[PDB]
Amino acid sequence: PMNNDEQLEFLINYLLDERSESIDIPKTFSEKRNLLRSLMNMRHPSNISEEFLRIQDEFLSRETANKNLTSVEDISLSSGKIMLWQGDITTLSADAIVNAANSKLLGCFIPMHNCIDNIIHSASGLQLREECNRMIMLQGGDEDVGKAKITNAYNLPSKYVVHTVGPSIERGMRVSSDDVKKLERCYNSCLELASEYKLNSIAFCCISTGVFNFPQKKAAEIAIRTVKDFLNSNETSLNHIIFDVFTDKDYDIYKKLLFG
Ligand SMILES: [Zn+2]
């Protein structure tokens, strides 16, 4: 019964066999780990060995348990039902985390790319892309901006992942009212679906910032307002909405707006 390094070798070797190739297995653990992520990032969704899945799960679950995990009650920075936390969303045991997805909803196919979509899929497992693929098959095509779908979170410490597609801003364009309205719809759709599943806590990433080029201050102002308007006007199971920010800049913006 394999150790941690044998599990990692096994997973890498299986994915390389599937491609009919062979690179030289890197030296350092962290090199091989990055090879695994790349291989996972690129795998188009399809039937896969259950032996692989079992080993993937032991491997990724153990990785999850060796991170420093955060529970919702550990977050000290809060205003009523709203919380603000700077940290890695794959280490937060909210009922649901929000994935800022794209319209194909299969995650990120670019190896090592450090968008949240990539990071979430990398830590969750290949099953997340598969579950997403099925919801695409069933609806008969691509996901529109401003909606929300819920999946299992697999080897993350959260129970569910909620996938939403935000608007993108053309380079050098000002944000328009259409753009704002779409981003409000992302937040609301997430909040409504979480309410319908009776979740207690949900964590948002900064939807549409980064790759989709939405300006960070305006995005925050919209995220905060939409969440607040939703809480002020619905009876909801939700008691904790967490704004999970990764950058120092996002932290400073949300902090000033919520507490400053
Ligand atoms: Zn990406």
Numbering used by the authors: 0 to 259
What do the authors of the reporting publication say about this deposited model?
In some pathogenic microbes, the response to oxidative stress is controlled by a SirTM/zinc-containing macrodomain (Zn-Macro) pair responsible for establishment and removal of the modification, respectively. Strikingly, however, the “catalytic loop” found in all other MacroD-type enzymes (also termed “loop 1”) is replaced with and extended loop containing the zinc-coordinating Cx(4)HxC motif, here termed the Zn-loop. To gain a closer understanding of the functional role of the 3α-bundle and coordinated Zn2+ ion, we solved structures from the three sub-branches of Zn-Macros namely from S. aureus (SauMacro), Methanobrevibacter oralis (MorMacro), and macrodomain-fused SirTM protein (Mfs1) from Fusarium oxysporum f.sp. cubense race 1 (Foc1Mfs1) in their apo form as well as of S. pyogenes (SpyMacro) and MorMacro bound to ADP-ribose (ADPr). In all structures, the Zn2+ ion is tetrahedrally coordinated with three metal-coordination residues within the Zn-loop, while the fourth coordination-contact is exchangeable and is provided by either ADPr, a water molecule, or a symmetry-related protomer within the crystal.
However, our data do not support this binding mode: first, the different orientation of the diphosphate-binding loop in our apo structures shortens the cavity, which would sterically hinder the binding of the dithiolane moiety. Surprisingly, neither MorMacro, which arises from a minimal operon containing only the Zn-Macro/SirTM pair, nor Zn-Macros derived from Msf1 fusion proteins could demodify SpyGcvH-L. In contrast, all Zn-Macros could demodify Glu-/Asp-ADP-ribosylated PARP1 E988Q. On the other hand, the absence of positive interaction surfaces in the other family members of the Zn-Macro family (having neutral to negative surfaces) might provide an energetic barrier to GcvH-L binding and explain the absence of activity from these macrodomains.
